[PDB]
């Protein structure tokens, strides 16, 4: 086509979606990771994660307001990945990289799994 | 912080949100623009438009599944702006610029109003 494109649009959209999350505006699901609870927007979770895409495209699961993750999932790892979904920034540290990578494999977030693998390889 | 950032994340999120819109997945509102109907995600509309942000933060309107726009709004202008919200690309043409600018003023989409004003000024 002959469209023009606003370079910062996608980043500005994501920033506003994170502001809605902050302010608990139109959040429509609670993700439970053992004793912790995280509120989010199903559409953002599906856009970032192959696991959430599969969950919320299922004709029964699409209607659930609570999703319980596998008990082996680390809440801090999940929190770091949820923040990445809404900001593009990943708080990857020596002390959390193993939990983050395991969580990203479970959630099916291939670019995160890729940077974790590279950071681990560099320390070996 | 000491975060790393994935450059393409925001663009990839927006592309996936447009794929959900295409496939009518988790759309939760119908915008009516006279005889036409447009299905969308409230969160994407709020992230892009000051008018939708005000509508869906209202304690009564947040619960509506149908929103009727002012009868003066042009459906083609709205369609072009809805596509821009989900893609960052604006199909601005000599034949639609006046309707697009009027619609963007109503929807409170300041960057669009800005490029329309500039394109109009250049032709004068």
């Amino acid at each position: 086509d002959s469209c023009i494109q606003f370079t910062r649009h996608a980043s500005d959209v994501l920033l506003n979606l994170n502001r809605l999350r902050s302010r608990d505006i139109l959040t429509d699901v609670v993700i439970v990771v053992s004793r912790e609870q995280f509120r989010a927007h199903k559409t953002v979770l599906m856009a970032c994660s192959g696991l959430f895409y599969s969950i919320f495209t299922d004709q029964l699961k699409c209607n659930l307001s609570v999703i319980n993750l596998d008990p082996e999932i680390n809440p801090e790892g999940f929190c770091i990945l949820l923040d990445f979904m809404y900001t593009s920034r990943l708080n990857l540290r020596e002390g959390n990289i193993m939990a983050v990578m395991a969580t990203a494999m479970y959630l099916q977030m291939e670019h995160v799994v890729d940077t974790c693998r590279k950071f681990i390889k560099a320390s070996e | 912080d000491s975060c790393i950032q994935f450059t393409r994340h925001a663009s990839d999120v927006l592309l996936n949100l447009n794929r959900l819109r295409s496939r009518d997945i988790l759309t939760d509102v119908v915008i009516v623009v006279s005889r036409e109907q447009f299905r969308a995600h409230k969160t994407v509309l709020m992230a892009c438009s000051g008018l939708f942000y005000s509508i869906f933060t209202d304690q009564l309107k947040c619960n509506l599944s149908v929103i009727n726009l002012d009868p003066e709004i042009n459906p083609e202008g709205f369609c072009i702006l809805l596509d821009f919200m989900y893609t960052s690309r604006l199909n601005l043409r000599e034949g639609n610029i006046m309707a697009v600018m009027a619609t963007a003023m109503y929807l409170q989409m300041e960057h669009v109003v800005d490029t329309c004003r500039k394109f109009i000024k250049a032709s004068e």
Partner: peptide, 4 residues
Amino acid sequence: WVIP
């Protein structure tokens, strides 16, 4: 704004 740019030409994509």
